[PDB]
Amino acid sequence: NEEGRLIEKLLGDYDKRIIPAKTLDHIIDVTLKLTLTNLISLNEKEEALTTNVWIEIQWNDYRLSWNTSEYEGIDLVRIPSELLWLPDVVLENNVDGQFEVAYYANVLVYNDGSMYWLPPAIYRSTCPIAVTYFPFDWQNCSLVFRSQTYNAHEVNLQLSAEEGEAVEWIHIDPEDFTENGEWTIRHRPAKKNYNWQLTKDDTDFQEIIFFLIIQRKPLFYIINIIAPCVLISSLVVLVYFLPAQAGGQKCTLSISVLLAQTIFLFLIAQKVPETSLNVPLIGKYLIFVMFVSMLIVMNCVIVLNVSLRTPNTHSLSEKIKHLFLGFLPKYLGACNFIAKSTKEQNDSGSENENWVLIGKVIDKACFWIALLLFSIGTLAIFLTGHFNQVPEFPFPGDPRKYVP
Amino acid sequence: SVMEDTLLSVLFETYNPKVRPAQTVGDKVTVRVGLTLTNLLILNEKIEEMTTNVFLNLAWTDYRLQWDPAAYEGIKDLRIPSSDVWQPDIVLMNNNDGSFEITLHVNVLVQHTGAVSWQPSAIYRSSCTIKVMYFPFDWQNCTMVFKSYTYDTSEVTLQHALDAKGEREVKEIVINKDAFTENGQWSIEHKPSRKNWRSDDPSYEDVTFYLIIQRKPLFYIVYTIIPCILISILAILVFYLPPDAGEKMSLSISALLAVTVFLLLLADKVPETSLSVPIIIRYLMFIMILVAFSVILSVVVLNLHHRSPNTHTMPNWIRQIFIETLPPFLWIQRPVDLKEAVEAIKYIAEQLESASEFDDLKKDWQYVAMVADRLFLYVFFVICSIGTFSIFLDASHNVPPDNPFA
Amino acid sequence: VNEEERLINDLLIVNKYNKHVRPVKHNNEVVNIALSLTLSNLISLKETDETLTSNVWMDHAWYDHRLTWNASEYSDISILRLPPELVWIPDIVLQNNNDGQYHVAYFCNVLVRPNGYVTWLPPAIFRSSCPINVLYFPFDWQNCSLKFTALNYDANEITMDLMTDTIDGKDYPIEWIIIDPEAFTENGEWEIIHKPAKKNIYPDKFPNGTNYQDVTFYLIIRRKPLFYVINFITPCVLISFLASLAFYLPAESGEKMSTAISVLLAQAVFLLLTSQRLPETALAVPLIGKYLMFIMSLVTGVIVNCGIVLNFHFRTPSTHVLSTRVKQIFLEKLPRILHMSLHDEIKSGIDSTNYIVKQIKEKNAYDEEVGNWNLVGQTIDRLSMFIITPVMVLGTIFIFVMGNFNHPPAKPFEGDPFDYSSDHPRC
């Protein structure tokens, strides 16, 4: 095998601790190309994005150059990466301590010194979760690659080119790509970025950022959380048709609705990050419906108080009686002692009937008010959750699309 | 210079740790394998994995590590780094995680006759299949399988470790009286050891150490069984409550909710394997069915109580069964201008008489309801008592065998 | 130039230092390793996992005659710092640990003096396994241990022993865990009552087996229960009082059972939340758990009694008779003891009036019977209250006083009169 002689010739006077600069002031052009195989997950609690990628780092090492005529026309050999100098390209925005790649595959080196390294990696990048429109939200995550050791006077990070066109995207490979399910990739641009707060000798002056703009598919959440929550919260307006005559259990129904809404709030908290910069849209809806339910509990207490008033404890003045009976509903739509006892009980019965009529009028009016309020709130919340789509362009000011 | 340094220099001048110590081609290195359990850490039933702290008492003979103590100032034994000598890859093939080899790698002891003895310590997460029946009154049988990963019967011969004296051979897990802490949840009923062979391939041999451990069922009795017994008592009490007091549902469905909460908070203590249903979960199923039927029969009793002759007419068979047939058995025996004024009194007297007959019919319906309520009370009491007693009796009958069957 | 390079080259290279040989002049001689522990921070004690996670500094001291030099011959080198991978170190390991961490976390350099004295102070994060005694939880004190052993050599080759300090010319063993005031953070949940240290020798074993000697550091730590008291005990007692006084609710209102049932549900909730904050061990039932079991049983009895009262209240003469004994007991005796506070047409009309009066009389008799039943029910309610509330209060007081009286022993060991305190060295 001539590869043995070739490799023992190449790695003879070679050490991996020295950047292969031809002369003084010679910048090594290191170019990157990401390939997303599977968007494994977006863990909201840790605000982490776990992705399976193949990273392609390409450069030139003049020391590892030979003559094919002298080695039976060998123009490509694989050398373990541990035996070669590497540009030390790392993911800067990682949640854990994993900076470099996971596998450290072999490097393909060509006769002219071209170095092609394609290691796979599981990257747990960090990205703040904009939870304002959850679950109808889109997340704008990014992977930032820098050189951990060399600065802009030594290496030159660049995007890969194919036929003069620089690859400005993440290059989803049709052969080995898998959809994530809940997350769909709307945009995937790539861009070289500078800081301008550091001079070009600080190893953080230049970065290469791969942006993943993804959109959550909310059918699962709509079916399993929002729809049950709306259906349960719609029962709080049903309380106004229950009788107030020490039955029907208005308070029990309203309190049970409130408790169910609290359970749904806990369920939401069990799926939403603790970012605390903004309150989730579903969380805002839950708070709104809980407040409405508390107000309806107040209304039930007041109606039970009014409809159970007796002529003893309360006096029904004519100003209130006429107002709540003649105007609003139209807008809304030895026998001597026996006779005295019968009349005195009938008067109390009539007063109780008037009070329950007042209670029913209040029930109708407050039912219409609460129905309108709940419907408007639900429509507003789940219509501003809708009409919230991913921006048409990846970077908003730019007119470029960043697609193959 | 110390004679130990010279002895080490002479001993390892050409020694190669990568070659098996065979005096002649075709010889087998007999490796005695024993186990010393210092602490059975836990037995996680959720992942069916037993983690323990052990010492692996390995012994073999290396003919190259021989010398004459008389020529080295009486050095009869040496303690040398484990990585400088050959060693069998005695690993736990039964490990649940990826850890096969040793954690500690203590120094190996070599005698002047070549007898190498290595006793490295390790933390082993072995894979133990969990028999779900009878939990939490269970008796698990967790095996730890040790063998050379790379050497088969044609190269090494696994044997049982010897005792402190060389004449006796140990066939069981050695538990040091000192440095051993008994687990607060499991008790070691049997700890045998055995050499295992698999037929159809005469190149396989294991040393398997069996831990037959019996669970102490406390923290399960107290925290699940007794509260569920109290809930069952409430479910029985549901029937003695009168239908007129509107709290039969508030008690029965509350008991049902309590049982379901017990289920959902016990779901994180039982294995997810579905070969069978554990005794405690089966008892919870029984209690759920009993309480649900209590709710159904309470609804039936409430429906019977509020029936009226104006709305319902009592069938003949209902009266026959629930008036003069069952109450004897259940001891619920029933104990036993002037012209206008005249017309007014007669009408109200007739209305009172009609109301009295109506009340008599309504009381008949309520009596039927009460008789049915008492019958259901007795039936539920006997059914609950019999079921609970039978379930816990067969749970208590489950004990580990006497002959481990090694 | 620097003389340390020449000194190290002479000590380790010229002399052919072998780090795999005991620092002994000749065999059949022991290398004594002095051992000490310093508790920088008691990180946590997880009862569910039964683990003690502690931050310690583990000091070793010994002699290495090979690492000896003449100070005046090397321009007065007083101390030397050498990496552990270049010199022989005794491998002292924590034998009882839940995770596979036996050695120290960081292998700091070792300090050598011209007489051959070598000292090593590496830090460590140790997760030791100590059983948790939950008998008096949360007013409980735990007794955790850290056992260090030498598994690379037997007692005939190296001899572990406690490090010794010198006060006014007399040397005393440091038989306790050192707590440095400049580096120590109180846990805030556990208070160290006793911190002894012993060198254990097991005569049943042999000196040549590495099971012969141990060095054990004990931490007896008392839990400060204010957090657990405030956040679990007070709400539970307050809720139990509701079931205690549920008897005061009248039977006419259809909410007598509901209060007791809800209190029982709250007690079960507290029980199942407490069960998770303690190990799954069967050695003993927790004090708080036992109290809650007693309270739940009492509340169940209260629910049964309320059901009995309701049954006695709504029974009617149409179905249930009023026996003489029931009256003579409940209507009179118990309330005294408990100090409870024309032509034929007109003839038909007269007969109609007679029937009206007879029906009124029957209704009055029915009303008096149901009133007697209601009074019997109220009497049973008062009796149940006066028999249940005091026993509940007494049980709560007794249980919590017995728990609060649980104090750690004055001495850390039963048979040892000496108190392993830093203020009273034995010398």
Binding site: D176, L235, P243 | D89, N96, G98, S127, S254, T260, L275 | -
Partner: protein, 385 residues
């Protein structure tokens, strides 16, 4: 052994582990790869990961390691550390947790003809997309894709040992049953290297979940609460406690919905049958509660302010024959007042009667709906054959 010591010294003298074992660089190394599944450690549905304990047996011929047994005392097989010889670099393409390749690096058997037989262990925590449509009565088909990473098919060839992975010593899962398992070999062209095909082998397993645990722990209580919702109509509205039963069952179903949500993945590819059954049951409960409030309102409907229409009287008086059950097929002012009271009482009794009739009709229709709904939801997948 002195003979084996000499042999190992001689073999590992000019041997370079970097270089492939081919005699000529034009040739290729054909590695026979088989995977045996010792144990299915777990199937995490929420994270869509399968943890499996496997042995990745692989055999290949290394010419540089051959020797003559008669020279070295008749030794025909030795064992060498895997770090000393050239090793094929198998990588698990689909991967979520753990390393992509073999990390344990156990010893390997070397035959005197150069036949290396390296069988290292591994734990594959491989990503695999689960179909949650039929939960819990689902079968998951998912794979492990192992391939040579840095070498194309013209320099390193991988070949399956057999048509199916070896499950001779496979521990019974206790939660899944292996309906089928098979490995397929693919020549795939990637965008990196369009002119050379890369070889890989995908071993796919079909695992049918045993549903006994999930059924007992989740499904049975949900059926019980659905039955109770059907029952709630037989309760008389006069006793109260009807709303109590309804809300109790609603809260129970909410808790069980939370429990189920904690189990299944959040993917939206297909709605689980358990999720749609929960939604159906919750809609059932909401409809029961709404029509129950309607029944309660009609029962307590005032006989004075609400005159009973003629059509309701007709319908809910002639419906009873169609249903075969237990239902029925000063001196003057006091008299006048009580006559009016009894007339109003009878008028209210008419409303109570129509409410009872509606309750019976709803009870029948809701029992039928519950039975039909549960059968339609579950028998679709329960009938596998």
């Amino acid at each position: 052994s002195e003979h084996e010591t000499r042999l190992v010294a001689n073999l590992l003298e000019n041997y370079n582990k970097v270089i492939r074992p081919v005699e000529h660089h034009t040739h290729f190394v054909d590695i026979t790869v088989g995977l045996q599944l010792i144990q299915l450690i777990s199937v995490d549905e929420v994270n869509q990961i399968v943890e499996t304990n496997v042995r990745l047996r692989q055999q290949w011929i290394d010419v540089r390691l051959r020797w003559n047994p008669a020279d070295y005392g008749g030794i025909k097989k030795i064992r060498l550390p895997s770090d000393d010889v050239w090793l094929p670099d198998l990588v698990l393409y689909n991967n979520a947790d753990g390393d992509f390749a073999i990390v344990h690096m156990t010893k390997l058997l070397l035959d005197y003809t150069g036949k290396i037989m390296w069988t290292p262990p591994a734990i594959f925590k491989s990503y695999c997309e689960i179909i949650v449509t039929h939960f819990p009565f689902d079968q998951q088909n998912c794979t492990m894709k192992l391939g040579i990473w840095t070498y194309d098919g013209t320099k390193v060839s991988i070949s399956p040992e057999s048509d199916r992975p070896d499950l001779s010593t496979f521990m019974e899962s206790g939660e899944w049953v292996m309906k089928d398992y098979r490995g397929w070999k693919h020549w795939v062209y990637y965008t990196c290297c369009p002119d050379t095909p890369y070889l890989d082998i995908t071993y796919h397993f079909i695992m049918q979940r045993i549903p006994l645990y999930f059924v007992v722990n989740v499904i049975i209580p949900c059926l019980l609460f659905s039955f109770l919702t059907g029952l709630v109509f037989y309760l008389p509205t006069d006793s109260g406690e009807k709303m109590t039963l309804s809300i109790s069952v609603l809260l129970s179903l909410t808790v069980f919905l939370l429990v189920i949500v904690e189990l299944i993945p959040s993917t939206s590819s297909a709605v689980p049958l358990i999720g749609k059954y929960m939604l159906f049951t919750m809609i059932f409960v909401i409809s029961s509660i709404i029509i129950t409030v309607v029944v309660i309102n009609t029962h307590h409907r005032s006989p004075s302010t609400h005159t009973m229409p003629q059509w309701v009287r007709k319908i809910f008086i002639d419906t009873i024959p169609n249903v075969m059950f237990f239902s029925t097929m000063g001196v003057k002012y006091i008299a006048e007042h009580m006559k009016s009271d009894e007339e109003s009482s009878n008028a209210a009794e008419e409303w109570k009667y129509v409410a009872m009739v509606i309750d019976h009709i709803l009870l029948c229709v809701f029992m039928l709906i519950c039975i039909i709904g549960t059968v339609s939801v579950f028998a679709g997948r329960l009938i596998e054959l």
